Write a protein that binds this ligand. Structure first.
Ligand SMILES: Cc1cc2ncn([C@H]3O[C@H](COP(=O)(O)O)[C@@H](O)[C@H]3O)c2cc1C
Ligand SMILES: Cc1cc2ncn([C@H]3O[C@H](COP(=O)(O)O)[C@@H](O)[C@H]3O)c2cc1C
Lengths: 347, 347
């Protein structure tokens, strides 16, 4: 039951956070001098799945892949098959997230939640259908299909926790997916489409007008309820967006941290927090996406990314890049010396 | 001869940069989607010491330690001995830079260029004197002493290059050093002291006025020539600042990259670029320091850091934290697959 799932998400452990802060203040450095690295360590200490201390065991990046009917509206320059081809490359370790994950010592899990092609060997099969419906003329899927995918992905995610995974990263792969992502952001934040529609995978500037038009039509035609995150996902979202939201709900239920990626992921996080506000404390930003609507989405999530790389690739590449930062906060916490031990006293 | 040194700094290799850009454009991703990670890889390809390709061999962080006479003016809350104590801890691996360097697989070299205490076993000895002169009433040192230290540090730095080191990080340790750092930044940028004097190691807000006053006096009394970087360093700088500038000149001469740290390092980089503009292409920013004058210093260096961590510890801790990013750009370059190989064609 999805209701049980959402009900059982743990609140953060304030007691462990207090012990953590005290320990950090006593380290060999002026109090608060390591800034965000200190607040990150405290955040981690409060997550129940981490056993009262900032720590990182195995790391995994979950890449949700799916095609979208809205591609027919001419909102993407990349051929539709690129989704299936790149998904295949994910199993070969040659994509951007694969290379960055390897560099961070993380494993990449490629999940097909709705690719419009024959099944790809090596890819986790959780496909709902061959691509979702064209949001410009109707809903992407039924509410039942959205809830079912959320549940299955949430379970798969927390199941990995039993394999030693303590840190997740979310990612996606799907031609035309920056369109539903913009639709969702517009609805959740109440911002106009023009302010949130970006160039995605190098869409020519002369084709942007059409993209904005399609986004408005999707909203006018479906009339999604902004107060109902699942309604929004099933109407103007996509299977990949749903999957990403599911990883966030699964990690939160598991009491573990999840690193966001770029714009697509911010869209999924807005949905996840709308569905269950208790998910918020488990989300960790990675980078500040070069996508046009990134600033608005992040402001509504009250998040300030650590990395400013002007990145806009997607795939969970930003999440993988930030993993070393999470490990750095843990190393600081566990390995630094203490002031008292050196007889150093500071006001 | 310092003149020879500055004369022999190599210009970047445009031919290798062109080959690099072509290769990056052909990788499995929409052109330019990895943003700053792509420009970083190209920057590295142009550095002659890297052999025409983005690569990272051994990594080292050089921490310059020294005391300052200006401490007597009440501009620092930390006792003067903390410099010597922390320098000792650097050899034990318990400080913040030590923990972060280990995490990045880098070695920390602790160099005493002017600590006001007995020599510390395990620390590289290059001390000019026991602390520099109080800049509030005169110069920190003679021009001869500044040039000599620049030379020695520059040589030590490029000598490490022969040991397999291809990536450097600069750092410092010295109670009261945010004062000369502010004086230098004010002089090089023409900004008022009030706009560049920060709280350093948690200086109380009620003591800031005095700090600004001391900085103005240092400048009025010494009258350093902003067009002469060495004049500025020897008059209102410190031994640690000089050492940091020396690492930058040494790495540039060696045709290798150097990662900056925080405010202290920005001050040393302004000097280094004033002395030899050819040093600029070898400098790589790490993070955006929480120090008040950071924004102004960075704007004058035309640099945009990758990490926003609100860090203000110093020691080269920011430089160590960014090393994984440099390695990430190299991994992307060498390990990603190619579009043509997957028959993917994009406008
Ligand atoms: C070769 C290639 C690799 C990619 N890896 C991620 N994306 C990104 O591009 C898509 C969204 O952009 P849009 O809405 O404009 O279609 C997603 O697949 C996203 O992951 C890629 C796109 C391409 C072409
Ligand atoms: C325990 C301790 C460890 C440090 N590590 C770096 N700094 C930083 O503080 C000093 C500059 O700040 P100010 O100008 O206010 O004195 C430098 O040593 C700098 O590296 C430290 C300072 C302290 C107290």
């Amino acid at each position: 039951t999805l209701h049980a799932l959402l009900r059982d998400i743990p609140a953060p452990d304030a007691e462990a956070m207090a012990r953590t802060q005290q320990h950090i203040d006593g380290l060999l450095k002026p109090p608060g001098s390591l800034g965000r690295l200190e607040t990150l360590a405290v955040q981690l200490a409060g997550m129940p799945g981490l056993n009262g201390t900032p720590q990182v065991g195995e790391k995994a990046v979950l890449v949700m892949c799916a095609d979208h009917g809205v591609w027919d509206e001419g909102v993407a320059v990349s051929p539709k098959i690129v989704t299936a081809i790149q998904a295949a490359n994910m199993t070969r370790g040659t994509t951007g997230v694969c290379v960055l994950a390897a560099q961070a010592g993380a494993k990449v899990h490629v999940i097909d939640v709705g690719i419009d092609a024959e099944p790809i060997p090596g890819v986790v099969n959780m496909r709902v259908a061959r691509g979702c419906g064209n949001i410009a003329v109707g809903p992407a899927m039924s509410r039942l299909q959205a809830e079912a995918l959320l549940l299955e992905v949430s379970r798969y995610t927390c199941d990995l926790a039993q394999r030693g995974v303590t840190l997740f990263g979310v990612g996606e792969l799907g031609m035309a997916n920056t369109t539903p992502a913009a639709a969702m952001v517009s609805v959740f934040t109440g911002s106009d489409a023009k302010e949130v529609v970006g160039i995605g995978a190098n869409l020519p500037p002369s084709r942007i007008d059409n993209k904005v038009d399609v986004v408005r039509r999707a909203i006018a035609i479906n009339q999604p309820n902004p107060r109902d995150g699942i309604d929004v996902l099933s109407k103007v979202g996509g299977f990949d967006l749903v999957g990403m939201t599911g990883v966030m709900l699964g990690a939160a239920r598991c009491g573990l941290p999840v690193l966001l990626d770029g714009f697509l992921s911010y869209s999924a996080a807005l949905a996840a927090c709308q569905i269950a506000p208790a998910v918020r404390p488990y989300l960790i930003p990675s980078h500040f996406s070069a996508e046009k609507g990134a600033r608005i989405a992040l402001a509504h999530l009250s998040m300030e990314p650590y990395l400013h790389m002007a990145m806009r690739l997607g795939e969970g590449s930003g999440a993988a890049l930030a993993m070393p930062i999470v490990e750095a906060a843990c190393a600081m916490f566990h390995n630094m010396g203490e002031l008292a031990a050196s007889n150093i006293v500071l006001p």
